[PDB]
Coordinates of C-alpha atoms and ligand atoms in Angstrom, one line a residue:
Chain A
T656 CA 54.9 63.4 125.6
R657 CA 56.7 63.8 122.2
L658 CA 54.6 62.3 119.4
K659 CA 56.6 60.2 117.1
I660 CA 55.3 61.2 113.6
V661 CA 56.0 58.8 110.8
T662 CA 55.8 59.7 107.1
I663 CA 56.9 58.7 103.6
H664 CA 58.4 60.2 100.5
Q665 CA 55.6 61.2 98.2
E666 CA 55.6 64.4 96.1
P667 CA 54.0 66.9 96.4
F668 CA 52.7 65.9 99.8
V669 CA 56.2 65.1 101.2
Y670 CA 59.5 66.2 99.6
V671 CA 62.7 64.7 101.1
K672 CA 66.1 66.4 100.5
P673 CA 69.5 66.1 102.2
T674 CA 70.7 68.7 104.8
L675 CA 73.6 71.2 104.2
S676 CA 77.1 70.7 105.7
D677 CA 76.1 72.4 109.0
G678 CA 73.0 70.2 109.5
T679 CA 70.4 72.9 108.6
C680 CA 67.9 73.0 105.8
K681 CA 68.3 75.4 102.8
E682 CA 66.3 78.5 103.1
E683 CA 63.8 78.4 100.3
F684 CA 60.9 80.8 99.6
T685 CA 57.7 80.3 97.5
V686 CA 57.2 82.5 94.4
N687 CA 55.0 84.8 96.5
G688 CA 57.8 85.4 98.9
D689 CA 56.8 83.4 102.0
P690 CA 59.3 81.0 103.7
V691 CA 59.0 77.3 102.9
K692 CA 58.8 75.5 106.2
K693 CA 60.9 72.4 106.7
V694 CA 61.6 69.9 109.4
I695 CA 64.5 67.5 110.2
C696 CA 63.2 64.0 109.4
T697 CA 65.4 61.0 110.1
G698 CA 65.3 57.8 108.1
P699 CA 67.1 55.6 105.5
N700 CA 68.6 57.3 102.3
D701 CA 69.3 54.3 100.0
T702 CA 69.5 56.6 109.9
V703 CA 70.8 60.1 109.0
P704 CA 68.9 63.5 109.1
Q705 CA 67.1 64.9 106.1
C706 CA 64.9 67.9 105.2
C707 CA 61.1 67.2 104.9
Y708 CA 58.6 69.7 103.5
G709 CA 55.3 69.8 101.5
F710 CA 51.5 69.7 101.8
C711 CA 51.6 67.2 104.7
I712 CA 54.4 68.9 106.7
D713 CA 52.6 72.3 106.6
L714 CA 49.5 70.3 107.9
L715 CA 51.6 68.7 110.7
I716 CA 52.8 72.1 111.6
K717 CA 49.2 73.4 111.7
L718 CA 48.0 70.6 114.1
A719 CA 51.1 70.9 116.3
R720 CA 50.3 74.7 116.9
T721 CA 46.5 74.1 117.3
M722 CA 46.7 71.1 119.7
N723 CA 50.1 72.2 121.3
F724 CA 52.3 69.1 121.0
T725 CA 55.8 68.4 120.0
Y726 CA 56.9 65.9 117.3
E727 CA 59.9 64.0 115.9
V728 CA 59.4 63.1 112.2
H729 CA 60.8 59.9 110.9
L730 CA 60.6 58.1 107.5
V731 CA 59.0 54.6 107.6
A732 CA 61.7 52.0 107.8
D733 CA 60.6 49.6 104.9
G734 CA 59.6 52.6 102.7
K735 CA 55.9 51.2 102.5
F736 CA 52.4 52.5 103.0
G737 CA 51.2 49.3 104.7
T738 CA 49.4 46.1 103.9
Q739 CA 48.5 43.1 106.1
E740 CA 50.1 39.7 105.0
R741 CA 50.3 36.2 106.4
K742 CA 49.5 35.4 112.1
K743 CA 48.7 38.2 109.7
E744 CA 51.0 41.2 110.3
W745 CA 50.8 44.8 109.2
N746 CA 53.9 46.3 107.4
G747 CA 54.7 49.9 106.3
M748 CA 53.5 53.0 108.3
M749 CA 50.5 50.9 109.5
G750 CA 52.8 48.4 111.2
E751 CA 54.8 51.2 112.8
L752 CA 51.6 52.8 114.2
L753 CA 50.3 49.7 115.9
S754 CA 53.7 48.3 117.2
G755 CA 54.3 51.8 118.8
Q756 CA 57.2 52.9 116.6
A757 CA 54.9 55.8 115.6
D758 CA 52.2 57.8 117.4
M759 CA 50.7 59.5 114.3
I760 CA 50.8 58.9 110.5
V761 CA 51.1 62.1 108.5
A762 CA 51.0 61.3 104.8
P763 CA 48.8 60.7 101.8
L764 CA 47.4 57.6 103.6
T765 CA 44.3 56.2 101.9
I766 CA 41.3 55.8 104.2
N767 CA 39.7 52.3 103.6
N768 CA 37.8 49.6 105.5
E769 CA 40.6 47.1 106.1
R770 CA 42.8 49.7 107.8
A771 CA 40.0 51.4 109.8
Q772 CA 39.5 48.1 111.6
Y773 CA 42.9 48.5 113.3
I774 CA 43.5 52.3 113.5
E775 CA 41.6 55.6 113.7
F776 CA 41.5 57.9 110.7
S777 CA 40.9 61.6 110.9
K778 CA 38.2 63.3 108.8
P779 CA 39.6 63.4 105.2
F780 CA 42.0 66.2 104.6
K781 CA 41.7 65.5 100.8
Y782 CA 39.3 63.4 98.6
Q783 CA 40.7 61.8 95.4
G784 CA 40.6 58.8 93.0
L785 CA 42.7 56.2 91.2
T786 CA 44.1 56.7 87.7
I787 CA 46.6 55.4 85.2
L788 CA 49.8 57.3 84.3
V789 CA 50.9 56.6 80.7
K790 CA 53.0 58.0 77.9
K791 CA 51.4 60.8 76.0
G792 CA 49.3 59.2 73.2
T793 CA 48.4 55.9 74.9
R794 CA 44.6 55.8 75.1
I795 CA 43.4 53.4 78.0
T796 CA 39.7 53.1 78.0
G797 CA 39.4 51.7 81.5
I798 CA 40.0 48.7 83.9
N799 CA 38.8 46.2 81.2
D800 CA 41.3 47.0 78.5
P801 CA 42.7 44.2 76.3
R802 CA 46.3 44.9 77.2
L803 CA 45.3 44.6 80.9
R804 CA 42.8 41.8 80.9
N805 CA 44.9 39.8 78.5
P806 CA 48.4 40.8 79.7
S807 CA 51.8 40.3 77.9
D808 CA 55.5 41.4 77.9
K809 CA 54.6 43.8 75.1
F810 CA 52.6 46.0 77.6
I811 CA 53.8 46.1 81.2
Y812 CA 51.7 47.6 84.0
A813 CA 52.1 47.8 87.7
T814 CA 51.5 49.7 91.1
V815 CA 53.5 50.1 94.2
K816 CA 54.2 47.2 96.5
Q817 CA 52.4 47.1 99.9
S818 CA 49.9 49.8 99.3
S819 CA 46.1 49.4 99.4
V820 CA 46.1 49.3 95.6
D821 CA 48.4 46.2 95.7
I822 CA 46.5 43.9 98.1
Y823 CA 43.2 44.9 96.4
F824 CA 44.6 43.7 93.1
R825 CA 46.1 40.5 94.7
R826 CA 43.3 39.5 97.1
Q827 CA 40.2 41.2 95.7
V828 CA 40.2 41.7 91.9
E829 CA 37.9 39.4 89.8
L830 CA 40.8 38.6 87.5
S831 CA 43.5 36.0 87.6
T832 CA 46.3 36.9 85.3
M833 CA 46.5 40.6 86.2
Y834 CA 48.0 40.1 89.6
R835 CA 50.3 37.3 88.2
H836 CA 51.7 39.9 85.7
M837 CA 51.6 42.8 88.2
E838 CA 53.4 40.7 90.9
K839 CA 56.3 40.4 88.5
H840 CA 56.6 44.1 87.9
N841 CA 55.4 46.1 90.9
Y842 CA 57.7 48.8 92.2
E843 CA 59.1 49.7 95.7
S844 CA 58.3 53.4 95.5
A845 CA 56.1 55.7 93.5
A846 CA 59.0 57.8 92.2
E847 CA 60.7 54.8 90.7
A848 CA 57.5 53.7 88.8
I849 CA 56.9 57.3 87.6
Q850 CA 60.5 57.4 86.1
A851 CA 59.9 53.9 84.6
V852 CA 57.0 55.2 82.7
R853 CA 59.2 58.1 81.3
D854 CA 62.1 55.6 80.4
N855 CA 59.6 53.2 78.9
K856 CA 60.5 50.4 81.5
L857 CA 56.7 50.5 82.5
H858 CA 53.8 51.2 80.2
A859 CA 51.1 52.0 82.8
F860 CA 51.3 53.1 86.5
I861 CA 48.1 52.6 88.5
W862 CA 48.2 55.0 91.5
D863 CA 46.6 58.0 93.3
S864 CA 45.1 60.6 91.0
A865 CA 46.4 63.5 93.4
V866 CA 50.0 62.4 92.9
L867 CA 49.7 61.4 89.1
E868 CA 47.8 64.6 88.1
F869 CA 50.5 66.7 89.8
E870 CA 53.2 64.6 88.0
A871 CA 51.5 65.0 84.6
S872 CA 51.1 68.8 85.1
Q873 CA 54.9 69.1 85.3
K874 CA 55.8 66.5 82.7
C875 CA 54.6 67.1 79.1
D876 CA 55.4 63.5 78.0
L877 CA 53.0 62.1 80.7
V878 CA 49.2 62.0 80.8
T879 CA 46.6 60.4 83.1
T880 CA 43.8 58.3 81.7
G881 CA 40.7 57.1 83.6
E882 CA 38.8 57.7 86.8
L883 CA 39.2 54.1 87.7
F884 CA 36.8 52.8 90.3
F885 CA 35.6 55.2 93.1
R886 CA 36.9 58.0 95.2
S887 CA 38.5 57.7 98.7
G888 CA 40.1 60.2 101.1
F889 CA 43.5 60.9 102.7
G890 CA 43.5 61.3 106.5
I891 CA 45.8 61.4 109.5
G892 CA 46.4 57.9 111.1
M893 CA 46.2 57.3 114.9
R894 CA 45.7 54.4 117.2
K895 CA 42.1 53.6 118.0
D896 CA 42.0 55.1 121.6
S897 CA 44.6 57.8 121.6
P898 CA 43.2 61.1 123.1
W899 CA 44.0 63.2 120.0
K900 CA 41.1 61.8 117.9
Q901 CA 38.6 64.5 118.4
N902 CA 40.9 67.5 118.1
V903 CA 42.7 66.2 114.9
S904 CA 39.4 66.0 113.2
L905 CA 38.1 69.3 114.6
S906 CA 41.3 71.0 113.3
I907 CA 41.0 69.5 109.8
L908 CA 37.4 70.6 109.5
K909 CA 38.2 74.0 110.7
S910 CA 41.2 73.9 108.2
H911 CA 38.6 73.3 105.4
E912 CA 36.2 76.0 106.5
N913 CA 38.8 78.8 107.0
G914 CA 40.5 78.2 103.6
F915 CA 43.8 76.9 105.1
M916 CA 43.4 73.6 103.1
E917 CA 42.6 75.4 99.9
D918 CA 45.8 77.4 100.4
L919 CA 47.8 74.1 100.8
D920 CA 46.3 73.1 97.5
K921 CA 47.4 76.3 95.8
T922 CA 50.9 76.2 97.3
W923 CA 51.7 72.5 96.6
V924 CA 49.2 70.8 94.2
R925 CA 47.5 73.1 91.7
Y926 CA 50.0 73.5 88.8
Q927 CA 50.0 73.5 85.0
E928 CA 52.4 74.3 82.1
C929 CA 52.0 71.7 79.3
Chain B
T64 CA 19.1 47.2 120.4
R65 CA 16.4 49.4 118.9
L66 CA 17.4 52.8 117.6
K67 CA 15.2 55.9 117.1
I68 CA 16.1 57.3 113.7
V69 CA 15.3 61.0 112.9
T70 CA 15.2 62.1 109.2
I71 CA 14.0 65.0 107.1
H72 CA 12.1 65.5 103.8
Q73 CA 14.9 66.1 101.2
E74 CA 14.5 64.6 97.7
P75 CA 16.2 62.6 96.4
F76 CA 17.7 61.4 99.8
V77 CA 14.3 61.1 101.6
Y78 CA 10.9 61.1 99.9
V79 CA 7.8 61.1 102.2
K80 CA 4.3 59.9 101.0
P81 CA 1.0 58.9 102.7
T82 CA 0.5 55.3 103.8
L83 CA -2.5 53.4 102.5
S84 CA -5.9 53.2 104.2
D85 CA -4.6 50.3 106.4
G86 CA -1.3 52.1 107.4
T87 CA 1.0 50.0 105.2
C88 CA 3.1 51.1 102.2
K89 CA 2.2 50.4 98.6
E90 CA 4.8 48.4 96.5
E91 CA 6.6 50.5 93.9
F92 CA 9.4 49.9 91.4
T93 CA 12.2 52.1 89.9
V94 CA 13.1 52.9 86.3
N95 CA 15.2 49.6 86.3
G96 CA 12.3 47.7 87.8
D97 CA 14.0 47.2 91.2
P98 CA 11.8 47.1 94.5
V99 CA 11.6 50.5 96.2
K100 CA 12.2 49.6 99.8
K101 CA 10.0 51.7 102.1
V102 CA 9.7 52.3 105.9
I103 CA 7.0 53.6 108.1
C104 CA 7.9 57.0 109.5
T105 CA 5.8 59.1 111.9
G106 CA 5.6 62.9 111.7
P107 CA 3.8 66.1 110.5
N108 CA 1.7 66.6 107.3
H109 CA -1.4 66.1 113.3
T110 CA 1.0 63.2 113.6
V111 CA 0.4 60.3 111.1
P112 CA 2.4 57.3 109.9
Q113 CA 3.9 58.0 106.4
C114 CA 6.0 56.1 103.9
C115 CA 9.7 57.1 103.6
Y116 CA 12.2 56.1 100.8
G117 CA 15.3 57.1 98.9
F118 CA 19.1 57.2 99.1
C119 CA 19.2 57.7 102.8
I120 CA 16.5 55.2 103.5
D121 CA 18.4 52.5 101.5
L122 CA 21.5 53.4 103.3
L123 CA 19.7 52.9 106.7
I124 CA 18.4 49.5 105.6
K125 CA 22.0 48.5 104.6
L126 CA 23.5 49.6 107.8
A127 CA 20.8 47.6 109.7
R128 CA 21.3 44.5 107.6
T129 CA 25.1 44.7 108.3
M130 CA 25.0 45.4 112.1
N131 CA 21.5 44.0 113.0
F132 CA 19.9 46.9 114.9
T133 CA 16.2 47.4 114.6
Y134 CA 14.9 50.9 114.0
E135 CA 11.9 53.2 114.2
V136 CA 12.1 56.3 111.9
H137 CA 10.4 59.7 112.5
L138 CA 10.5 63.1 110.8
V139 CA 12.1 66.0 112.8
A140 CA 9.3 67.9 114.6
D141 CA 10.4 71.5 113.9
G142 CA 11.3 70.5 110.3
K143 CA 15.0 71.7 110.4
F144 CA 18.6 70.6 110.0
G145 CA 19.8 72.2 113.2
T146 CA 21.7 75.3 114.4
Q147 CA 22.9 76.4 117.8
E148 CA 20.9 79.4 118.9
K149 CA 23.8 76.9 124.3
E150 CA 21.0 74.6 122.8
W151 CA 20.5 73.0 119.3
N152 CA 17.2 72.9 117.4
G153 CA 16.3 70.5 114.5
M154 CA 17.8 67.0 114.1
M155 CA 20.9 68.1 116.1
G156 CA 18.5 69.1 118.9
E157 CA 16.6 65.8 118.9
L158 CA 19.8 63.7 118.8
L159 CA 21.3 65.6 121.8
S160 CA 18.1 65.5 124.0
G161 CA 17.7 61.7 123.2
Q162 CA 14.5 62.0 121.1
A163 CA 16.8 60.3 118.4
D164 CA 19.7 57.9 118.6
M165 CA 20.9 58.5 115.0
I166 CA 20.4 61.1 112.2
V167 CA 20.0 59.7 108.8
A168 CA 19.8 62.4 106.2
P169 CA 21.9 64.6 104.0
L170 CA 23.5 66.1 107.2
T171 CA 26.4 68.4 106.5
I172 CA 29.7 67.6 108.3
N173 CA 31.2 70.8 109.8
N174 CA 33.4 71.8 112.7
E175 CA 30.7 73.3 115.0
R176 CA 28.4 70.3 114.8
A177 CA 31.4 68.0 115.3
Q178 CA 32.1 69.6 118.7
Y179 CA 28.8 68.2 120.0
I180 CA 28.2 64.9 118.1
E181 CA 30.0 62.1 116.3
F182 CA 29.8 62.1 112.5
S183 CA 30.5 58.9 110.5
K184 CA 32.9 58.9 107.6
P185 CA 31.2 60.7 104.8
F186 CA 28.8 58.9 102.5
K187 CA 28.8 61.7 100.0
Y188 CA 31.2 64.6 99.3
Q189 CA 29.7 67.7 97.7
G190 CA 29.5 71.5 97.9
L191 CA 27.3 74.7 97.7
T192 CA 25.9 75.9 94.5
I193 CA 23.0 78.3 93.4
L194 CA 19.8 77.2 91.8
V195 CA 18.6 79.8 89.3
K196 CA 16.3 80.1 86.3
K197 CA 18.2 79.2 83.1
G198 CA 19.8 82.3 81.5
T199 CA 20.9 83.7 84.8
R200 CA 24.7 83.5 85.3
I201 CA 26.5 84.2 88.6
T202 CA 30.3 84.4 88.8
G203 CA 30.4 83.8 92.6
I204 CA 29.6 85.4 95.9
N205 CA 30.8 88.8 94.6
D206 CA 28.1 89.3 91.9
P207 CA 26.6 92.9 92.3
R208 CA 23.2 91.3 92.8
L209 CA 24.4 89.5 95.9
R210 CA 26.9 92.1 97.3
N211 CA 24.5 95.0 97.0
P212 CA 21.0 93.6 97.3
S213 CA 17.5 94.7 96.3
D214 CA 13.9 93.6 95.6
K215 CA 15.0 93.3 91.9
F216 CA 16.8 90.0 92.8
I217 CA 15.6 87.9 95.7
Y218 CA 18.0 85.3 97.1
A219 CA 17.8 83.0 100.1
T220 CA 18.6 79.7 101.8
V221 CA 16.8 77.4 104.3
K222 CA 16.5 78.7 107.9
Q223 CA 18.5 76.7 110.5
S224 CA 20.8 75.0 108.1
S225 CA 24.6 75.2 108.5
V226 CA 24.5 77.7 105.5
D227 CA 22.0 80.0 107.3
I228 CA 24.0 80.6 110.5
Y229 CA 27.3 80.8 108.5
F230 CA 26.0 83.7 106.5
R231 CA 24.5 85.3 109.6
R232 CA 27.8 85.2 111.6
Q233 CA 30.4 86.3 109.0
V234 CA 31.4 89.9 109.3
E235 CA 32.2 89.8 105.5
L236 CA 28.6 88.8 104.6
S237 CA 26.7 91.5 106.8
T238 CA 25.1 93.1 103.8
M239 CA 23.7 89.7 102.6
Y240 CA 22.3 88.5 106.0
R241 CA 19.8 91.4 106.4
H242 CA 18.3 90.8 102.9
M243 CA 18.2 87.0 103.5
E244 CA 16.6 87.4 106.9
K245 CA 13.5 88.6 105.0
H246 CA 13.4 85.8 102.5
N247 CA 14.9 82.6 104.1
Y248 CA 12.5 79.6 103.6
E249 CA 11.3 76.9 106.0
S250 CA 12.1 74.0 103.6
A251 CA 14.1 73.3 100.4
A252 CA 11.1 72.1 98.5
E253 CA 9.4 75.4 99.1
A254 CA 12.5 77.4 98.0
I255 CA 12.8 75.1 94.8
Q256 CA 9.2 75.8 93.8
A257 CA 9.7 79.6 94.3
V258 CA 12.6 79.4 91.7
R259 CA 10.1 78.0 89.2
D260 CA 7.3 80.5 90.2
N261 CA 9.9 83.4 89.9
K262 CA 9.2 84.3 93.5
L263 CA 12.9 83.5 94.3
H264 CA 15.7 84.4 91.8
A265 CA 18.6 82.4 93.5
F266 CA 18.4 79.5 96.0
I267 CA 21.7 78.8 97.8
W268 CA 21.9 75.1 98.7
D269 CA 23.7 71.8 98.5
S270 CA 24.9 70.7 95.1
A271 CA 23.8 67.0 95.5
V272 CA 20.2 68.3 95.9
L273 CA 20.3 71.2 93.4
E274 CA 22.1 69.3 90.6
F275 CA 19.3 66.6 91.0
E276 CA 16.6 69.3 90.7
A277 CA 18.2 70.8 87.5
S278 CA 18.3 67.3 85.9
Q279 CA 14.5 66.9 86.3
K280 CA 13.7 70.5 85.3
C281 CA 15.1 72.0 82.1
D282 CA 13.9 75.6 83.2
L283 CA 16.4 75.4 86.1
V284 CA 20.2 75.3 86.2
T285 CA 22.9 75.5 88.8
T286 CA 25.5 78.1 88.5
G287 CA 28.8 78.4 90.3
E288 CA 30.7 76.6 93.1
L289 CA 30.6 78.7 96.3
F290 CA 33.1 78.3 99.2
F291 CA 34.6 74.9 99.6
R292 CA 33.5 71.2 99.6
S293 CA 32.1 69.2 102.6
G294 CA 30.5 65.8 103.3
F295 CA 27.3 64.2 104.4
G296 CA 27.6 62.0 107.3
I297 CA 25.4 59.9 109.8
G298 CA 25.1 61.7 113.2
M299 CA 25.3 59.9 116.5
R300 CA 25.8 60.9 120.1
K301 CA 29.5 60.9 121.2
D302 CA 29.3 57.7 123.2
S303 CA 27.2 55.6 120.8
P304 CA 28.5 51.9 120.7
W305 CA 27.6 51.8 116.9
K306 CA 29.9 54.6 115.7
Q307 CA 32.8 52.3 114.6
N308 CA 30.6 49.8 112.8
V309 CA 28.7 52.6 111.1
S310 CA 31.9 54.1 109.6
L311 CA 33.3 50.7 108.7
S312 CA 30.0 49.9 106.8
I313 CA 30.1 53.3 105.0
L314 CA 33.7 52.8 103.9
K315 CA 32.9 49.3 102.7
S316 CA 29.8 50.6 100.8
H317 CA 32.2 52.9 98.8
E318 CA 34.4 49.9 98.0
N319 CA 31.8 47.1 97.3
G320 CA 29.7 49.0 94.6
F321 CA 26.9 49.8 97.0
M322 CA 27.1 53.7 97.1
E323 CA 27.5 53.7 93.3
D324 CA 24.3 51.7 92.9
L325 CA 22.4 54.2 95.1
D326 CA 23.6 56.9 92.7
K327 CA 22.4 55.0 89.7
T328 CA 19.1 54.4 91.3
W329 CA 18.2 57.8 93.0
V330 CA 20.5 60.5 91.6
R331 CA 21.4 59.9 87.9
Ligands
LIG1026 C1 42.1 50.2 94.6 C2 40.7 50.6 94.7 C3 40.4 50.6 96.2 C4 40.0 49.4 96.7 C5 39.8 49.3 98.1 C6 40.0 50.4 98.9 C7 40.4 51.7 98.4 C8 40.7 51.8 97.1 C9 41.1 53.1 96.6 C10 40.3 54.0 95.9 C11 40.8 55.1 95.4 C12 42.1 55.6 95.5 C13 43.0 54.7 96.1 C14 42.6 53.4 96.7 C15 43.7 52.8 97.3 C16 44.8 53.8 97.0 C17 46.2 53.5 97.5 O1 46.6 52.4 97.9 N1 47.0 54.6 97.5 C18 48.4 54.6 97.9 C19 48.6 55.2 99.2 N2 47.8 56.4 99.3 C20 48.3 54.2 100.3 O2 47.9 54.5 101.4 O3 48.6 52.8 100.2 N3 44.4 54.9 96.4
LIG1027 C1 30.1 78.1 103.8 C2 29.0 77.2 104.3 C3 29.7 76.2 105.1 C4 30.2 76.7 106.4 C5 30.9 75.8 107.3 C6 31.0 74.4 106.9 C7 30.5 74.0 105.7 C8 29.9 74.7 104.8 C9 29.4 74.1 103.6 C10 30.1 73.7 102.5 C11 29.6 73.0 101.4 C12 28.3 72.7 101.4 C13 27.4 73.0 102.4 C14 27.9 73.7 103.6 C15 26.8 73.8 104.5 C16 25.8 73.3 103.8 C17 24.4 73.2 104.4 O1 24.1 73.8 105.5 N1 23.4 72.4 103.9 C18 22.2 72.1 104.5 C19 22.0 70.7 105.2 N2 22.9 69.7 104.4 C20 22.5 70.8 106.5 O2 23.1 69.8 107.0 O3 22.2 71.9 107.4 N3 26.1 72.8 102.6

């Protein structure tokens, strides 16, 4: 049985590029000489084949080899991570897992309570926090800043629509006007919001620290500010009683102990130049 | 249903004190003035009821209040975390033989243990460090004193932890295993005292525990981060009907401020 793997565009965990003329992927190599491994993902580009690669595709490839299965990677239809909205239905990668469109989510998918009620998560492959991406020289103290708590058109802030960050701000935050403001401004994808911070369309992007710290490392105009809230993991997503549960988690724990995960960090995440 | 909980002495996760004359626990309060919740636990000191409290005990009480199991707690008989040497000893051993239904302790999540039992989602994520006397600095595992050992610098860990059998099995660490096989301790608290007495020069152990010890004691510091990070989790047998509700509760305790409050109370 071929596992339908679903994923999403999210650097540096998943890079998405167009194929060449002949339908292959461009032969790239890391600075240390090793081949960069890529797969033919299908999905929307504004269904046609594209080249997928990164932290999470290297991980997919590991698990494939260890558990001996075949995969067909596809990009989530709506371009979302997945929330549950009013009959309350799950969207994004979460919706696709449950409805059968996917067999496995391989992505920087945040492990939380809500989602774990409906799917199985592997043991975390990474552990990380929330932070705020801003222009260099924009001191944010924390969650309770004046410009946030008392919002305005002079200082716009946002997150990505239909992530666990979004529904938590809508449904759960102890603050009225913040979600009213944020609902006006939230972005469809993380790449768009990161670019908006650069082009001054957005003054603060609330998002995964693993993505934003990587982004700030490569962009000297951008800094992160805050360890907001608490830490949470990324894990593989599966249906609650699929027979892969045990071995996916065994593989990830083995990957942490034999240094394979540390290597994925060195290849894709750990970077500095500013 | 009623669950048999097995736990282990490991400050600040589990403290163990004598009961009163009449076999009850005295009421105590924290630095804040909060009520120290305590549970009767049986075990060694000749098997007497004792009083058990701390991070892991507050976590057990929370799990019980969410899912409505009753419990009786006891301290592991042989005193150990558990290694496979194909039968397990320690808390692993008790859980597998049915002397416990659930392990509640700073129990390291690793591949080998996860082949035999279910772990919950982690309640804490941490790593290995070294407890030394202040003024000692260690770069990492490849410090001369570790790589090429002697009586001039004693170093050790606790017998029958994950650490122990990991050092004993690695071909790379052959030279270290033979020196540690002379000096490995029975309990963490014994090893920690040795660092103060200058009977042990370097104790290799969990950062959550050793960072707490250095906070209390100005003579001690932690130096380094060895290897990689790993979690603590609740242990259960593979076919426990509580494993889904345990993990859900742990995930929610990260998101509702509960774990953070345990940190303020017991750790910082
Ligand atoms: C908000 C805080 C929060 C509330 C309730 C539960 C979890 C968190 C949490 C804590 C720390 C990082 C992080 C999240 C969500 C989150 C996120 O949504 N990331 C985007 C993406 N990885 C995706 O899966 O939606 N990242
Ligand atoms: C390279 C040691 C190792 C090998 C394989 C898998 C994980 C680790 C690891 C990494 C980070 C902290 C920590 C350990 C073990 C460990 C330990 O054994 N502590 C004692 C106690 N918590 C108990 O559960 O036995 N503490």
